[PDB]
Amino acid sequence: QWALEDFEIGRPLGKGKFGNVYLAREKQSKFILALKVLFKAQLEKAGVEHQLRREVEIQSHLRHPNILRLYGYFHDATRVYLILEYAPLGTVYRELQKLSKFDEQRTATYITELANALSYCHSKRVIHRDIKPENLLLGSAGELKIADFGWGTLDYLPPEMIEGRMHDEKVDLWSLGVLCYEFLVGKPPFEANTYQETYKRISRVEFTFPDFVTEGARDLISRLLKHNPSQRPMLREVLEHPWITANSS
Numbered sequence: 557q558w559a560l561e562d563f564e565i566g567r568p569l570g571k572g573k574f575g576n577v578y579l580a581r582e583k584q585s586k587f588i589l590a591l592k593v594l595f596k597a598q599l600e601k602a603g604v605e606h607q608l609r610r611e612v613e614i615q616s617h618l619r620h621p622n623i624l625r626l627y628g629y630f631h632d633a634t635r636v637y638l639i640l641e642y643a644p645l646g647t648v649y650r651e652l653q654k655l656s657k658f659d660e661q662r663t664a665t666y667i668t669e670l671a672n673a674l675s676y677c678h679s680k681r682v683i684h685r686d687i688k689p690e691n692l693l694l695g696s697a698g699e700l701k702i703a704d705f706g707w708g709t710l711d712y713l714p715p716e717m718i719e720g721r722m723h724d725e726k727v728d729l730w731s732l733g734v735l736c737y738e739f740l741v742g743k744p745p746f747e748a749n750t751y752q753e754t755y756k757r758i759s760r761v762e763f764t765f766p767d768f769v770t771e772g773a774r775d776l777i778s779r780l781l782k783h784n785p786s787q788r789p790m791l792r793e794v795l796e797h798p799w800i801t802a803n804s805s
């Protein structure tokens with residue numbers, strides 16, 4: 557429906573595996589949004605075409621305030637364009653870097669926001685979203701927005717996905733643990749200098765806490781980071797968790 561001639565392109569906002577995202581404005585309405593540019597040549601030399609277009613026509617039907625919206629899309633001769641919600645306050649990564657680590661209120665708040673977004677995805681049968689801080693954006697009121705493109709790094713993957721086995725909903729509860737830890741500590745709990753070592757650290761579930769992490773947070777993270785998926789909580793139970801309810805908004 558749309559065309560490139562409909563939009564005025566602005567400053568760059570980020571670069572992903574598949575393309576660059578620019579700030580953009582639609583002329584008729586003056587609507588501010590983000591526009592992504594994917595070269596269909598680059599897509600077909602990695603063999604990723606149509607693998608993603610499934611997710612494109614899925615994302616389209618995912619309306620939730622803690623998930624970045626995909627308004628629509630179109631293609632010219634040599635390229636493909638995605639019209640997406642623009643998140644004013646940038647990535648959670650950029651924010652985590654400035655501050656080093658987040659306090660418990662900000663952290664629990666993001667975990668609540670994440671949980672609701674994931675609980676929503678799971679109701680719509682969408683499983684395993686890549687929620688690295690680099691893929692988390694911040695809306696105008698500092699509200700978290702899940703913004704990934706997957707359907708490299710092991711840091712957020714649970715044992716089952718790295719060890720080849722089948723997985724379910726509860727993958728996303730491991731990730732919440734990894735992120736609850738990374739928000740408070742500043743570094744994910746299984747970080748290492750090599751792929752091969754992170755693999756072991758994740759497999760053997762070898763994480764430790766700095767002195768400053770509270771016993772309530774040690775509890776939640778410990779609950780979320782279980783090798784056996786069955787043992788992990790439900791998202792309801794995470795939102796119910798005392799440490800969360802105490803500090804969250």
Ligand SMILES: CCc1ccc(/N=C2\S/C(=C\c3ccnc(Nc4ccc(C(=O)O)cn4)c3)C(=O)N2C)cc1
Nearest residue numbers: 569570571572577590624625626641642643644646703
């Ligand atoms: C909706 C489905 C979707 C999700 C993610 C996608 N991939 C993206 S989005 C993106 C960046 C992006 C999208 C929307 N809003 C912002 N907001 C920002 C970013 C940076 C700054 C800043 O540093 O000053 C300020 N605001 C950034 C991206 O880089 N990729 C790969 C593509 C489609």
